[PDB]
């Protein structure tokens, strides 16, 4: 079957953890939409424009990945995009109770959208965009957790 | 014995989950005070006035329920109201560590107030007011999680 | 109202933690039935008869407590005891998860039997029958965690 | 793409929860192998042959499901079945922790076998084979949690 | 060996829980730096100056404790201070997933800095500075959780 | 100061995870006692003598490590070894809960024996003796998770 999956998030910025997850998704699903939310939600270090461009570059090597931005309800977008699979990354440091809440709400909103939880490499299982941003903003080295293009952009952002 | 119990919260707005919990409480305790906190805590979608009126309507069918608003320390109000039972709803997606912290603090503040944790129906075990508000604010259908009166009020609020 | 509550468990043996919980229960409800399950699958250290005796003496000072043993389905025994409140203790977090399962199953078996979780004192928040037995198997001093009569029995049973 | 997925477990016995998960799997992948592990260390109630039979009938209505038993290393069996997706169900939180261990071990044993966690309906989020057996050992009504043929087998096995 | 340990935090204000942890640290390590972060992070009830002075007084009886303030990355300061041990208090109500995330990030940033988790007395295992501040700000008694000097300062702050 | 630390466990068998933890301990304290408990109730795969031998060789490269077996109460053995630091490893979250219980019990038995939790590398954060044995029972390759001598022993023991 030709499944269309959606992998939503703020990607602010996209990390090696995100790349790990989306790469794993492309191996089991025909088309993967990496959906970037225009979430002013607490000042996106990067803007949607930057957010999208960085993601497009970091996943350019992935043939069946499509980077697209969206506003408001993720489920409404997933429905319009005809996605039937919702990719969620599950870190060792994940808020499981929250993921359950989100998945059940998304199922209520769009039952035809099935939540699929993927696990990243042990290497990226203990980090997050906010932690990375916080560390970088406070003069810490986060080179190891980001694609080269994102690393360069981050330095420009904090300079 | 004639126990007086208090069921505190922001009820912003009251949901079917809250109704579930308070209804279960009225079956084991003589008088249940549904206490609504005037918690400006991050802009109450609804005002205390609205908050109270909506709750009064949603629990009007419950004979031994009294909806009352209060400000500042919940324990101080519970003490003045002569409550000896503190109702706490325990969702499957609850922050247990937080509930423990809260209960122990409340016990220090008022040892004569006993924390009672009740469990809602599987139906409401994965939702919360903030999630409901967030989904509704972003164009999602939350009709299923609210009493009719609250549903109508919510639509007016977001229009 | 005069509610009848049941506090089921293996109580092998009953500890100060159990005493703490049942005591809190007697202050909320008219009559409390401390129900000891045979639990053959657990290969209890003490026989049902022994555990019943131990608990009886350990709770003799509590006028409205009744100790009874049972091998039936807890739900059926609860219904037959005319109990409408099911008491459970919440100390540690992985207990909560297991407790929700039994609670939802028990609600399925007897919907009018309302689950009520109570929280023990900080003093007994880290003990369990199995841990006390483990320490006692190695001759460690567990006098602080058990009722006088239970400690003697545990000592005599292990030597 | 035509992916082959494997859904391993002890299935002692298979429950509606398992049915829920495998069903969600058949809607995402072309072929699903419901693999029943011998699991001698668990001292299963039903023999491998019995569990296989039970599952076969319980999933007969699902065209792209295949039930097979195995005593090999799950990873090796997966490779030999030509599966590239490993299905796992996430109901409760302590499962998630244990699941990450097996997932990371299995990824170490077969890196191309991608772990996929699915979430069951709220309806079966609190049941397990062991709990159903426990209730059944006490003659409790478990018809609601098992496929018709499994319930009969469970009844006949316990009397 | 002569180990130099660092115990970082906002100490806003320092509580009996903090005193408990730092006291335990001084018993196993030669020199303990109680590092106070100048974290404007959501309006420090107390200023760094106040924060430091209160801590110095509350730990004056501890000979090998040095109270020092720092800004930005904790790891950068720890490195400059030549610390090889990082003290983290682990409460029963701790965000473990967060502690893991933090520890792994700190290990990436400074591998020569080893994270050591200490456990406070049952007495302080269910509280935190934010909860204490919130309760006090809302007219609750928090005398029991603070050193006398902090208690006096807190009352002045809220008057 | 010259502290003596004890790292107790069943070590059945000792894994790279254990090696990771004890190694971190030797860098903080002068002398470390890796204490292997008989743990008859666990029905260990290897005898105490075997586990001691295995650990001795597995930690021979660590000058300040001492391997000893014991069947006494861990607290008493710690006191008799003149240890004032109790080393424990924290990998997964349900371990933390169980660890707090033993820690509080051990503090009750020997208040001057301070509990110290260390965190293993991401590399060994998902392994355990039981999981390695489980994989090995099915002939899976576990060379990556065990010291050379332990792997041989495990291979020879299972065939
Ligand atoms: N390092 C990672 N490994 C695996 N999954 C991840 C990782 N980081 C994020 N995810 C997952 O990707 C999705 C989107 O996450 P998001 O865009 O918020 O980035 P984030 O790192 O989680 O941000 P933040 O640090 O603000 O929490 C979520 O399902 C999340 O669990
Ligand atoms: N759906 C629900 N089922 C059971 N208990 C609930 C539910 N929603 C809230 N509660 C409980 O009722 C009490 C008050 O909760 P509150 O008023 O904050 O609503 P809320 O849904 O928890 O809000 P929020 O989404 O902002 O977290 C708490 O003890 C909470 O656990
Ligand atoms: N120390 C304690 N504090 C609070 N509740 C407790 C405590 N010990 C047991 N309980 C609760 O009492 C009920 C019965 O528990 P049980 O009879 O199994 O004793 P137990 O200590 O939990 O045994 P075990 O060590 O085998 O787990 C459960 O709901 C349990 O959560
Ligand atoms: N009710 C359920 N809902 C969702 N997933 C489930 C459910 N029961 C089992 N699973 C999942 O299916 C897989 C196999 O589980 P298993 O065969 O052990 O049955 P089980 O119910 O988990 O047994 P037990 O009661 O012995 O723990 C696991 O990944 C498990 O998480
Ligand atoms: N009562 C306590 N017992 C043990 N450790 C504590 C306690 N309070 C704080 N800690 C630990 O000390 C360190 C610093 O904590 P912090 O300075 O943020 O105070 P805090 O109480 O955790 O603040 P907040 O209430 O805002 O969360 C952390 O590692 C934290 O876990
Ligand atoms: N891989 C690991 N990483 C970090 N700490 C570990 C690891 N394995 C064990 N430990 C810790 O070492 C101590 C002793 O553990 P133990 O000897 O039981 O081995 P184990 O792996 O935990 O065994 P089991 O598989 O039976 O649970 C415990 O404090 C435990 O948390
Ligand atoms: Mn996130
Ligand atoms: Mn809430
Ligand atoms: Mn128990
Ligand atoms: Mn299972
Ligand atoms: Mn904090
Ligand atoms: Mn262990």
HSE toward the beta carbon, residue A105, CA cutoff 13 A: 27
Q: For chain A, how many residues are written?
A: 159
Q: Name the residue among A27, F46, D41, E125 with its Cα closest to residue B97.
A: E125
Q: Name the residue among E12, E43, E6 with its Cα closest to residue E129.
A: E12
* DSSP annotation of E95: -
* DSSP annotation of E133: H
Query: H helices of chain E, where?
Result: 16-26, 48-58, 74-80, 96-109, 129-137, 148-158
Q: What is the C-alpha separation between C119 and C109, in angstroms, rounded?
A: 25
Nearest C-alpha to atom 3 of ligand 6 is from which residue? Answer: F17
Report whether the peptide linkage leading into residue E38 is cis, meaning its omega lies within 30 degrees of zero.
no
Q: What is the C-alpha separation between B102 and B95, in angstroms, rounded?
A: 11
Q: What is the C-alpha separation between F28 and B105, in angstroms, rounded?
A: 36
Q: Is F89 in the pocket of ligand 6 (CB under 6 A)?
A: yes
Q: What is the C-alpha separation between B37 and B35, in angstroms, rounded?
A: 6
DSSP-based three-state secondary structure for D124: helix
The answer to whether the beta carbons of residues F93 and C94 sit under 8 Å apart is no
| Cross-chain residue pair A109–B135, CB shorter than 8 Å | yes
Q: What is the C-alpha separation between C99 and F159, in angstroms, rounded?
A: 41
Give the residue on A whose Cα is nearest the Cα of D4: A28
Q: Is E18 among the catalytic positions?
A: yes
Q: Is B56 exposed, middle or buried (0-12, 13-18, 19+ CB in 10 A)?
A: middle
Q: What is the C-alpha separation between D134 and C94, in angstroms, rounded?
A: 19
| Cross-chain residue pair F125–A123, CB shorter than 8 Å | no
| Cross-chain residue pair B122–C114, CB shorter than 8 Å | no
Query: Which subunits have 3 or more CB–CB pairs within 8 Å of chain F?
Result: A, C, D, E
Q: Is B42 among the catalytic positions?
A: yes
The answer to whether the beta carbons of residues D141 and D154 sit under 8 Å apart is no
The answer to whether the beta carbons of residues A48 and A12 sit under 8 Å apart is no
For chain B, the three-class secondary structure string (H helix, E strand, C coil) is CCCEEEEEECCCCCCHHHHHHHHHHHCCCCEEEEEEECCCCCCCCCCHHHHHHHHHHHCCCCCCEEEEEECCCHHHHHHHCCCCEEEEECCCCCCHHHHHHHHHHHHHHCCCCEEEEECCCHHHCCCCHHHHHHHHHCCCCCHHHCCHHHHHHHHHHHC
Measured CA distances, C3 to B19, B30, C30 (Å): 22, 10, 6
Chain E residues with a Cβ under 8 Å from any Cβ in chain F:
1-3, 24, 27-30, 84-85, 90, 92, 96-97, 100, 103-104, 107, 114-119, 122
Q: F5: which strand partners?
A: F32, F85
Other Cβ atoms less than 10 A from the Cβ of C130: the count is: 13
* Residue B46 Ramachandran class (φ > 0 left, ψ -120 to 50 alpha, else beta): beta
Q: What is the C-alpha separation between B58 and B53, in angstroms, rounded?
A: 9
C71, C97, C108: residue with CB nearest D92: C97
Q: Which residues, 6+ apart, have CB-to-CB distance to C10 below 8 Å?
A: C36, C37, C39, C42, C44, C51, C129
Nearest C-alpha to atom 22 of ligand 5 is from which residue? Answer: E128
Other Cβ atoms less than 10 A from the Cβ of D145: the count is: 23
Cα F87 to ligand 6 centroid, rounded to whole Å: 11
Q: Which residues, 6+ apart, have CB-to-CB distance to C106 below 8 Å?
A: C74, C75, C78, C86, C113, C115
Confirm or deny that C42 is annotated as ligand binding.
Answer: yes
The CA radius of gyration of chain A, in Å to the nearest whole number, is 15
* DSSP annotation of C69: E
Q: What is the C-alpha separation between D99 and F114, in angstroms, rounded?
A: 32
Taking CA A152 as the corner, what is the angle to CA A148 and CA A153, rounded to the nearest 5 degrees? 115
Measured CA distances, D61 to C96, D36, D151 (Å): 36, 18, 17
| Cross-chain residue pair F117–E114, CB shorter than 8 Å | no
Q: What is the C-alpha separation between A46 and A60, in angstroms, rounded?
A: 19
Provide the terminal-to-terminal Cα distance of chain B, rounded to the nearest Å: 48
* DSSP annotation of F142: -
Max CA distance (Å), chain D: 48
Model resolution, angstroms = 1.8
Q: What is the C-alpha separation between F109 and F103, in angstroms, rounded?
A: 10
Q: What is the C-alpha separation between F22 and F27, in angstroms, rounded?
A: 9
Q: Which atom, in ligand 3's list, is nearest to the CA of C87?
A: 29
Confirm or deny that E121 is annotated as ligand binding.
Answer: no
F29, F85, F119: residue with CB nearest E100: F119
Q: What is the C-alpha separation between B129 and B154, in angstroms, rounded?
A: 12
Mutate to test the interface with F, among C126, C127, C144, C145 (most CBs of F within 10 A): C126
The CA radius of gyration of chain B, in Å to the nearest whole number, is 15
C-alpha distance from E140 to closest chain F C-alpha (Å): 29
* DSSP annotation of C103: H
Q: What is the C-alpha separation between D117 and D98, in angstroms, rounded?
A: 13
Contacts of F42 in chain C (CB under 8 A): none
Q: What is the C-alpha separation between F111 and F104, in angstroms, rounded?
A: 9
Q: Is B159 exposed, middle or buried (0-12, 13-18, 19+ CB in 10 A)?
A: exposed
- The helix (run of H) or strand (run of E) holding residue D88 is strand D85-89
Give the residue on B whose Cα is nearest the Cα of A74: B138
Taking CA C115 as the corner, what is the angle to CA C110 and CA C116, rounded to the nearest 5 degrees? 160
CATH number for the domain spanning D113: value is 3.40.50.620
The answer to whether the beta carbons of residues F137 and F41 sit under 8 Å apart is no
Q: Is C151 in the pocket of ligand 3 (CB under 6 A)?
A: no
Q: Name the residue among E85, E87, E112, E113 with its Cα closest to residue E99.
A: E87
The answer to whether the beta carbons of residues E22 and E53 sit under 8 Å apart is no
Q: Is C129 in the pocket of ligand 3 (CB under 6 A)?
A: yes
Give the residue on F whose Cα is nearest the Cα of E25: F114
What is the best residue among E89, E100, E127, E135 to mutate for testing ligand 5's pocket, by most ligand atoms within 8 Å of CB? Answer: E89
The answer to whether the beta carbons of residues E40 and E10 sit under 8 Å apart is no
C-alpha distance from C64 to closest chain D C-alpha (Å): 28
Taking CA F20 as the corner, what is the angle to CA F15 and CA F25, rounded to the nearest 5 degrees? 125
* DSSP annotation of F35: E
- The helix (run of H) or strand (run of E) holding residue D19 is helix D16-26
CA dihedral B24, B30, B36, B37 (to 10 degrees): -110
* Backbone dihedral angles phi then psi of residue B151, each to the nearest 5 degrees: -60, -50
Other Cβ atoms less than 10 A from the Cβ of E91: the count is: 21
Q: What is the C-alpha separation between C150 and D14, in angstroms, rounded?
A: 42
Other Cβ atoms less than 10 A from the Cβ of A52: the count is: 19
Q: What is the C-alpha separation between C14 and C122, in angstroms, rounded?
A: 18
- DSSP per-residue letters across chain A: ---EEEEEE--SS--HHHHHHHHHHHTTSSEEEEEEE---TT--SS-HHHHHHHHHHHTTT-TTEEEEEE-S-HHHHHHHTT--EEEEE--TT--HHHHHHHHHHHHHH-TTSEEEEE---GGGTT--HHHHHHHHHTT---GGGS-HHHHHHHHHHH-
Q: What is the C-alpha separation between B53 and B49, in angstroms, rounded?
A: 6
Q: F37: which strand partners?
A: F70
Q: What is the C-alpha separation between A55 and C124, in angstroms, rounded?
A: 52
Confirm or deny that B70 is annotated as ligand binding.
Answer: no
* Backbone dihedral angles phi then psi of residue D60, each to the nearest 5 degrees: -55, -35
Q: For chain F, how many residues are written?
A: 159
Contacts of B104 in chain C (CB under 8 A): 119, 122
Cα C35 to ligand 7 centroid, rounded to whole Å: 45
C-alpha distance from B114 to closest chain C C-alpha (Å): 8
Q: Is B71 among the catalytic positions?
A: no
Which technique was the structure solved with, according to the deposited record?
X-ray
Cα A108 to ligand 8 centroid, rounded to whole Å: 21
C-alpha distance from D125 to closest chain A C-alpha (Å): 11
Taking CA C146 as the corner, what is the angle to CA C144 and CA C147, rounded to the nearest 5 degrees? 115
Q: What is the C-alpha separation between A25 and A7, in angstroms, rounded?
A: 9
The answer to whether the beta carbons of residues A53 and A12 sit under 8 Å apart is no
Binding-site residues, ligand 2, Cβ < 6 A: B 9-11, 15, 17-18, 21, 88-89, 91, 94, 120, 124, 127-131
Q: What is the C-alpha separation between C139 and C158, in angstroms, rounded?
A: 9
Give the residue on F whose Cα is nearest the Cα of D101: F126
Number of H helices, E strands in chain C: 6, 5
B97, B101, B109: residue with CB nearest E140: B109
The residue from A79, A91, A107, A157 that is catalytic is A91
Q: What is the C-alpha separation between E15 and E20, in angstroms, rounded?
A: 9
The answer to whether the beta carbons of residues A34 and A65 sit under 8 Å apart is yes
Contacts of F126 in chain A (CB under 8 A): 122
Pairing of strands F4-9, E65-70: unpaired
Q: Which atom, in ligand 5's list, is nearest to the CA of E145?
A: 1
Provide the terminal-to-terminal Cα distance of chain E, rounded to the nearest Å: 48
Pairing of strands B4-9, B31-37: parallel
The answer to whether the beta carbons of residues E17 and E49 sit under 8 Å apart is no
F92, F128, F141: residue with CB nearest D109: F141
- DSSP per-residue letters across D26-72: HTTSSEEEEEEE--GGG--SS-HHHHHHHHHHHTTT-TTEEEEEE-S
The residue from E79, E91, E151, E157 that is catalytic is E91
Report whether the peptide linkage leading into residue B13 is cis, meaning its omega lies within 30 degrees of zero.
yes
Q: Is F120 in the pocket of ligand 6 (CB under 6 A)?
A: yes
Angle between helices F148-157 and F129-137 (to 10 degrees): 50
Q: For chain B, how many residues are written?
A: 159
Report whether the peptide linkage leading into residue A13 is cis, meaning its omega lies within 30 degrees of zero.
yes
Q: Name the residue among D29, D27, D20, D15 with its Cα closest to residue D6.
A: D29
Q: Is D26 in the pocket of ligand 4 (CB under 6 A)?
A: no
Query: H helices of F7-128, where?
Result: 16-26, 48-58, 74-80, 93-109
DSSP-based three-state secondary structure for C64: coil
Report whether the peptide linkage leading into residue F3 is cis, meaning its omega lies within 30 degrees of zero.
no
The answer to whether the beta carbons of residues B151 and B117 sit under 8 Å apart is no
Q: What is the C-alpha separation between C76 and C82, in angstroms, rounded?
A: 10
Measured CA distances, C90 to A16, B114, C17 (Å): 40, 13, 10
Taking CA B111 as the corner, what is the angle to CA B109 and CA B114, rounded to the nearest 5 degrees? 115
- The helix (run of H) or strand (run of E) holding residue E111 is none
- The helix (run of H) or strand (run of E) holding residue C63 is none
* DSSP annotation of E84: -
- The helix (run of H) or strand (run of E) holding residue C116 is strand C114-118
Q: What is the C-alpha separation between C106 and C98, in angstroms, rounded?
A: 12
| Cross-chain residue pair D100–A119, CB shorter than 8 Å | yes
| Cross-chain residue pair A104–B94, CB shorter than 8 Å | no
Structural domain including C55 reads 1-159
Q: Domain total for chain E?
A: 1
Q: F85: which strand partners?
A: F5, F114
Q: What is the C-alpha separation between C118 and B103, in angstroms, rounded?
A: 10
Percent helix / strand / coil, chain F, rounded to 5: 45, 20, 35
Asked if C touches F (at least 3 Cβ pairs < 8 angstroms), the answer reads yes
User: Would you please indicate which residues of C are annotated as catalytic (active-site) residues?
Assistant: 18, 42, 91, 129
Percent helix / strand / coil, chain C, rounded to 5: 45, 20, 35
C-alpha distance from E2 to closest chain A C-alpha (Å): 28
C-alpha distance from E111 to closest chain A C-alpha (Å): 13
Q: Name the residue among C130, C78, C80 with its Cα closest to residue C105.
A: C78
What is the best residue among F7, F17, F39, F120 to mutate for testing ligand 6's pocket, by most ligand atoms within 8 Å of CB? Answer: F17
Q: B65: which strand partners?
A: B32
Asked if F touches D (at least 3 Cβ pairs < 8 angstroms), the answer reads yes
CA dihedral B117, B123, B128, B134 (to 10 degrees): 180
Angle between helices E48-58 and E148-158 (to 10 degrees): 150
Q: Which atom, in ligand 6's list, is nearest to the CA of F11?
A: 17
Report whether the peptide linkage leading into residue D99 is cis, meaning its omega lies within 30 degrees of zero.
no
């Amino acid at each position: 079957m030709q499944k269309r999956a959606i992998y939503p998030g703020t990607f602010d910025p996209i990390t090696n953890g995100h790349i790990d997850i989306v790469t794993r998704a492309t191996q089991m699903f025909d088309h993967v939409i990496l959906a970037i939310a225009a979430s002013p939600s607490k000042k996106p270090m990067f803007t949607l424009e930057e957010r999208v461009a960085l993601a497009q570059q970091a996943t350019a090597h992935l043939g069946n990945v499509e980077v697209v931005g969206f506003s408001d309800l993720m489920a409404n977008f997933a429905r319009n995009q005809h996605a039937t699979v919702l990719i969620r990354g599950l870190r060792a440091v994940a808020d499981f109770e929250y993921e359950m809440q989100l998945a059940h709400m998304n199922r209520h909103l769009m039952p035809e959208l099935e939540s699929v939880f993927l696990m990243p490499s042990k290497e990226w299982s203990f980090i997050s965009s906010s932690l990375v941003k916080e560390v970088a903003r406070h003069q810490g080295d986060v080179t190891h957790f980001l694609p080269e293009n994102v690393h360069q952009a981050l330095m420009a952002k904090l300079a």
